[PDB]
């Protein structure tokens, strides 16, 4: 009967207190065990981009380009035109300015645009950590739009957090405690729908994609979240100064709780190679 500060309300400066310098907010890939967080984030973008079989002169679309680290690796390591789209104004301005400083002989575009608006023809698509925000009632249209803008040899790499069914968690030996259910409720009131592995298969193969590979990075995310949490704790006083002890505690709770979910087996994260 009235109108009444969440983790969403934090500034980009707040995220720089605990993300690596490239501002990746998605699962890293510790290709070597002694990699730093930044090296492992680079390795995760490189892992994704390598699966696209990019050739010189192709155009690459990044759906949900975040703070731009994925397209930075694409511009630096491939001779391709890139288009990045995002619906975040902060990330749009950040990525446009970050990417403008990179030498290139190709075209580079960053747009404030959603996927349901995107009509350009592109040769390859990467989408890292954008799918989690889609509603399942939008899944079909997403894969259809992606399929239609690709050519006949088109490839797409979809990277997304995944959940398990109750039966799967049963068979796997994953016993969900009350603190796990308390945490899933916490995610409701502070963070709506996550796909299972089989869902990506269903909706991608319904849109005439073929699934050629799924790669699961469960324990890489546990390590990613562990490092994020250690960084934020190192920067606690600054985090509380920018925000509040309330917000610092919520973010630490959220990072360490998510870490626990990946470590114990409740959550996973997959890269899906889709071909046309
Ligand atoms: C939908 C857009 N978001 C992503 N794809 N991924 C994250 O939000 N990852 C993440 C998680 C998830 C386990 C927990 C704490 C903090 C972060 C990022 C800083
Ligand atoms: Cl990212
Ligand atoms: Mg992304």
From Swiss-Prot:
Catalytic residues (positions): 258
Q: Name one Pfam family in it.
A: CMAS
Carries keyword Iron? no
Q: Which UniProt keywords apply?
A: Cytoplasm, Lipid metabolism, Methyltransferase, S-adenosyl-L-methionine, Transferase
Where does this protein reside within or beyond the cell? Answer: Cytoplasm
Gene Ontology terms: biological process: lipid biosynthetic process; methylation
Q: What is its main location?
A: cytoplasm
Which SUPFAM superfamilies would you find in this protein's record?
A: S-adenosyl-L-methionine-dependent methyltransferases
The positions annotated for binding S-adenosyl-L-methionine are 25-26, 60-68, 86-91, 115-116
Query: Which GO molecular-function terms appear in the entry?
Result: cyclopropane-fatty-acyl-phospholipid synthase activity
Family of this protein: Belongs to the CFA/CMAS family.
Q: What is this protein called?
A: S-adenosylmethionine-dependent methyltransferase UmaA
């Amino acid at each position: 009967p009235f109108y009444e500060q969440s983790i969403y309300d934090v500034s980009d400066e707040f995220f720089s207190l605990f993300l690596d310098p490239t501002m990746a907010y998605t699962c890293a890939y510790f290709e070597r065990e002694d990699m730093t967080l930044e090296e492992a984030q680079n390795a995760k973008f490189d892992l994704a981009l390598d699966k696209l079989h990019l050739e010189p002169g192709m155009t690459l679309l990044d759906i949900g380009c975040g703070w731009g680290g994925g397209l930075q690796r694409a511009i630096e390591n491939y001779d391709v035109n890139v288009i990045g789209i995002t619906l975040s104004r902060n990330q749009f301005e950040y990525s446009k300015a970050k990417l403008a400083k990179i030498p290139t002989e190709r075209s580079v575009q960053v747009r404030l645009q959603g996927w349901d608006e995107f009509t350009d023809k592109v040769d390859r698509i990467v989408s890292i950590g954008a799918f989690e925000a889609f509603k399942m009632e939008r899944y079909a249209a997403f894969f259809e739009r992606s399929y239609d803008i690709l050519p006949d040899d088109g490839r797409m790499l979809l990277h997304t957090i995944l959940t398990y069914t109750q039966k799967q968690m049963h068979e796997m030996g994953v016993k969900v405690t009350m603190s796990d259910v308390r945490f899933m409720k916490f995610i409701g009131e502070e963070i709506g729908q996550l796909p299972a592995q089989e869902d990506i298969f269903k909706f991608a193969q319904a849109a005439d994609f073929s699934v050629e590979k799924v790669q699961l990075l469960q324990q890489h995310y546990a390590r990613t979240l562990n490092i994020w949490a250690a960084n934020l704790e190192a920067n606690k006083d600054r985090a509380i100064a920018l925000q509040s002890e309330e917000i610092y505690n919520k973010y630490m709770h959220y990072l360490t709780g998510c870490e626990h979910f990946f470590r114990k087996g409740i959550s996973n994260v997959g890269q899906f190679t889709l071909t046309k």
